């Protein structure tokens, strides 16, 4: 379906700055975040691939100057099982 | 019955990339993911005996770049009790 | 009131490998697993005491290949208050 | 035909641990063992090349704890005449 | 079914010593001896798991004073296919 | 009488791999195998001289990598007494 941008920040402030810069930086839909415990939270955005890529590469710049960005990755087309099994939005 | 494969990554982003490459690399069902807290999240796939092996050997490659891979392991034929007592897809 | 094997692994994947090895070693009953947070997962096993002893010794050897084994311990017969006040699958 | 997996151990005990690890490790069929004298005993399983490969690897890593392995080898597609001439459990009749 | 104790000795007097100690040590059925040729003779004993686990350790202690022991092992729960196509006493 | 080819190996795994290469390599007849004790097992194929001389080369080259080739030899025309006395398959 739509692409999959997500960045993981050890801390909530860096992840909120990430989500704000991603939804201001291009046309992506912040479907939410995920808590894997231990300080980590992961912000997830969905959209078309150029907007998702331009959103993550600006959210990483804006959340790098706040907190501890663990990992940034963009999936251009996730498989239908990954959308159907994981809390990423677009679950049928 | 079906063989079991697991990738454990300390982040959510690495787990999503591992789960994506496991499904894209072999005809292998993605059951879901188990959170254990502390960051550590495990993606659990299940399928043929060698398809799951190629899926883990290609999901490990993908998750080592966008994350920190803790444990990769394939069980070629797990017991009836393991599927009956753990959240691993084939619970009757 | 049978015995009690516990293998604690800081990974989920090492826990499931210890689980499969404990079940495939002897005739023991695997209830499930306890998530105490922070990564630490524990696999719990019930059976007569020598079967549990050999089961945990096989499960520790299979789990040292995969993950970090915290503790392996066998109680020959837990107290009635232990089974009634801790989630160990023999609650009346 | 079915894939062929053998583990030869210089000892009966390592052979039995190898055969038990093979039949618990995957979905194979322990069809028997071959005594060739001198202490050499060969455990033979039949199955599928994925299953026989994944079983024979665990049989080797469990038979090294007990005895000594001499040979471990998987034949993914043995010929018809070899199943007809050697005691390999898929003999017609 | 019943657990499986085996002691393989290169001598023959060592095998009778080991089989005698494994019978005297616990309630274990002596179920035979396997002559694999070339000196190597295996005593195969078979009973319950606590019985075999005590008996086989005692037979290991006794066989090492009389000959050269080759291998000592216990399978706590032998698979059905193992007992089928092997001369281990509990074949149907 | 057909030409005669034999590969003797210490081991049974080496003999089965040699017999597979001899049968798959040319149009010969795998008769059986002679167990001369001590772990030595000899594989005996019989067929035309070029067929046996190709089967023998391939069986030697394939059994060198799993085992312990003792002697490898091709008789193009065995004597009638050799077939009548020794168990080489063509006993009238």
């Amino acid at each position: 379906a739509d692409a999959l941008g997500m960045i993981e920040v050890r801390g909530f402030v860096g992840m909120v700055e990430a989500a704000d810069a991603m939804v201001k930086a291009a046309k992506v839909e912040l479907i939410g975040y995920e808590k894997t415990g231990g300080g980590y939270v992961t912000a997830v955005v969905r959209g078309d691939v150029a907007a998702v890529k331009a959103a993550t590469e600006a959210g990483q710049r804006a959340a790098e100057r706040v907190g501890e960005v663990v990992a940034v990755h963009v999936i251009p087309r996730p498989h239908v099982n990954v959308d159907a099994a994981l809390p990423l939005g677009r679950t049928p | 019955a079906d063989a079991l494969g697991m990738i454990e990554v300390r982040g959510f982003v690495g787990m999503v990339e591992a789960a994506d490459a496991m499904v894209k690399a072999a005809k292998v069902e993605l059951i879901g993911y188990e959170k254990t807290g502390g960051g550590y999240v495990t993606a659990v796939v299940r399928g043929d005996v060698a398809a799951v092996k190629a899926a883990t050997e290609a999901g490990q490659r993908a998750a080592e770049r966008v994350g920190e891979v803790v444990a990769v392991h394939v069980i070629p034929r797990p017991h009836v009790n393991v599927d009956a007592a753990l959240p691993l897809g084939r619970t009757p | 009131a049978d015995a009690l094997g516990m293998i604690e692994v800081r990974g989920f994947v090492g826990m499931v490998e210890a689980a499969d090895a404990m079940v495939k070693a002897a005739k023991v009953e695997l209830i499930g697993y306890e998530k105490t947070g922070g990564g630490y997962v524990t696999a719990v096993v019930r059976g007569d005491v020598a079967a549990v002893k050999a089961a945990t010794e096989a499960g520790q050897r299979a789990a040292e290949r995969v993950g970090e084994v915290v503790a392996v311990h066998v109680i020959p017969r837990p107290h009635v208050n232990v089974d009634a006040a801790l989630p160990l699958g023999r609650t009346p | 035909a079915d894939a062929l997996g053998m583990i030869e151990v210089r000892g009966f005990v390592g052979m039995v641990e190898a055969a038990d690890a093979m039949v618990k490790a995957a979905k194979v069929e322990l069809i028997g063992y071959e005594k060739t004298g001198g202490g050499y005993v060969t455990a033979v399983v039949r199955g599928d090349v994925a299953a026989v490969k994944a079983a024979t690897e665990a049989g080797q890593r469990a038979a090294e704890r007990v005895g000594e392995v001499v040979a471990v080898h998987v034949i993914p597609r043995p010929h018809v005449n070899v199943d007809a001439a050697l005691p390999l459990g898929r003999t017609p009749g | 079914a019943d657990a499986l104790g085996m002691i393989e000795v290169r001598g023959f007097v060592g095998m009778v010593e080991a089989a005698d100690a494994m019978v005297k040590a616990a309630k274990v059925e002596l179920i035979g001896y396997e002559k694999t040729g070339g000196g190597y003779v295996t005593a195969v004993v078979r009973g319950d798991v606590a019985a075999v686990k005590a008996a086989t350790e005692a037979g290991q202690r006794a066989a090492e004073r009389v000959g050269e022991v080759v291998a000592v092992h216990v399978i706590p729960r032998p698979h059905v296919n193992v007992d089928a196509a092997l001369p281990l006493g509990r074949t149907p | 009488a057909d030409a005669l080819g034999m590969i003797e190996v210490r081991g049974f795994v080496g003999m089965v791999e040699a017999a597979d290469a001899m049968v798959k390599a040319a149009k010969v007849e795998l008769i059986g195998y002679e167990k001369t004790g001590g772990g030595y097992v000899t594989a005996v194929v019989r067929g035309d001289v070029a067929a046996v001389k190709a089967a023998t080369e391939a069986g030697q080259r394939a059994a060198e990598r799993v085992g312990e080739v003792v002697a490898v030899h091709v008789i193009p025309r065995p004597h009638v007494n050799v077939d009548a006395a020794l168990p080489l398959g063509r006993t009238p």
Binding site: - | - | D48, V49, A50, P76, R77 | - | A26, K27, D48 | -
Partner: protein, 95 residues
């Protein structure tokens, strides 16, 4: 060394200071059938025996032959837990 059931627990308050941190158990000696009949000795746990288990204990100088009870005034210690009792071909007691 004789086998008996662990009947009870004994909680000493003012004790010899070496044996603090050491659990005490009233073991009454049982027959190999498994029914307790005899005198109850307060012996020290070294394996983890609870109430109702059939144990061996050993009294004397060989009650100190453990890392736990090395130079302590321990008259008897529990060295093993009975799983099976074979009596001439009849298993009288199982765990």
């Amino acid at each position: 060394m004789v086998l008996g059931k662990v009947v009870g627990t004994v909680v000493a308050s003012r004790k010899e200071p070496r044996i603090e941190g050491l659990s005490l158990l009233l073991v009454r000696a049982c027959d190999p059938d498994g029914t307790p009949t005899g005198g109850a000795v307060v012996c020290a746990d070294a394996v983890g025996a609870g109430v109702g288990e059939v144990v061996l204990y050993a009294s004397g100088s060989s009650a100190r032959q453990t890392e736990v009870t090395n130079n302590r005034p321990v008259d008897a210690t529990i060295m093993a837990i009975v799983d099976l009792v074979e009596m001439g071909g009849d298993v009288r007691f199982r765990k």
